[PDB]
């Protein structure tokens, strides 16, 4: 698949933050345009960082000014010494013609630019990030340029992996009107929905093998049988006793604290009552 591209879980966060910021600033979702930074070694391209870019819009056309890009390049060259321009990125659905004009514009800066594309409006269970690459055709008459998809890895370093694990593990993120239940049960709901999607696909494959659409794969069905045989996970009596212990412990911890809230309300009511029905 032409070159091999490795992605870091920091470009994704940068693009998501930029999209969220623009959406919150202008009220409505809006296409964002940035730039990719990384290291190229022969056939191995690695994307390590990104920074936002400034673009102007005349009629129905987007022009990226080069003065700001060059100043920002001089800026980032002082910190990331051995890091170079690789491509750009955008948010949206499938590639659009405007993406091809912007790619043509970027081609004047670098000979072989990449093209990342995030899809925040996706409605499926695969990563919205898709990496493309320019291809020049020899079509008779007018000459056009096309996008060829790419297969990308998700290489991370030690500190980046630690940070991503820490960020994705914690779930105490809620703030505002919504209850904390509405911030924890939603994470539980998403995890259960992913598991449900996987199990539904497995069941669909098993039924298709039963009917005849797909060839009879003995090993896959054997592994499905093994998966089904493990479904009643740890239904022993000791587990039930431990579960009941945990439930009773949480019940007692809730009781001590419901008592505290009631005592606080009692103090509040007594204080409000004293100044009104004072006997002096």
């Amino acid at each position: 698949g032409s070159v091999s591209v490795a992605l870091h879980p920091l470009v994704i966060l940068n693009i998501s933050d930029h999209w969220i910021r623009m959406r919150s600033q202008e009220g409505r979702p809006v296409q964002v345009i940035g730039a990719l930074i990384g290291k190229q070694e022969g056939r191995n391209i690695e994307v390590m960082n990104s920074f936002e870019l400034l673009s102007h819009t005349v009629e129905e056309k987007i022009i990226i000014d080069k003065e700001y890009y060059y100043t920002k390049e001089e800026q980032f060259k002082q910190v990331f010494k051995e890091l170079e321009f690789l491509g750009w990125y955008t948010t949206g659905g499938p590639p659009d013609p405007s993406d091809i004009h912007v790619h043509k514009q970027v081609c004047e800066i670098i000979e072989s630019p990449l093209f990342l594309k995030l899809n925040p409006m996706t409605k499926h269970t695969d990563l919205p990030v898709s990496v493309f690459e320019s291809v020049i055709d020899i079509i008779n008459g007018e000459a056009t340029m096309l996008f060829a998809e790419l297969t990308y890895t998700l290489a991370t370093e030690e500190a980046e992996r630690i940070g991503v694990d820490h960020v994705a593990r914690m779930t105490a993120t809620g703030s505002g009107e919504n209850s904390t239940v509405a911030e924890h049960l939603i994470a539980q709901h998403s995890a259960i929905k992913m598991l449900h999607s996987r199990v539904k696909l497995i069941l669909e494959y098993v039924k298709a093998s039963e009917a005849g659409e797909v060839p009879f794969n003995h090993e896959i069905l054997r592994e499905a049988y093994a998966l089904c045989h493990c479904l009643p996970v740890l239904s022993t009596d000791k587990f039930k006793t431990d579960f009941y212990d945990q439930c009773n412990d949480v019940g007692l911890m809730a009781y001590l604290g419901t008592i505290t809230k009631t005592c606080n309300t009692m103090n509040q009511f007594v204080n409000k009552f004293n100044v009104l029905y004072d006997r002096q």
Binding site: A182, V206, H218, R222, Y225, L227
Partner: protein
């Protein structure tokens, strides 16, 4: 123990309770009369996940409604007290 070495099954023996606690076992051969049982077990699991998902949504909606009800009552009392306060302030 020899069966564990071939890795067909995994587990730990228990002499005091006279039990063999199996943690993992391979899936034996299948025939065209247990595939329907595979579908039945997996379909029941899918309905189990759907029931849990529906329950989570209902509890989230109920908790949010309780939060809105308490906030509305809290602001309703504060609105009433200020009205009677402003009236006598010249």
């Amino acid at each position: 123990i020899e069966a564990v070495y071939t890795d067909i099954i995994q587990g730990k023996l228990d002499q005091r309770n006279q039990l063999l606690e199996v943690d993992f076992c391979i899936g034996r051969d299948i025939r065209k009369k247990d595939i329907n049982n595979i579908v039945k077990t997996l379909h029941e699991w899918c309905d189990g996940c759907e029931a849990v998902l529906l329950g989570i949504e209902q509890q989230v909606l109920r908790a949010n409604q309780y939060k809105e009800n308490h906030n509305r009552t809290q602001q309703q009392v504060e609105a009433e007290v200020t009205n009677i306060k402003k009236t006598l302030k010249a």
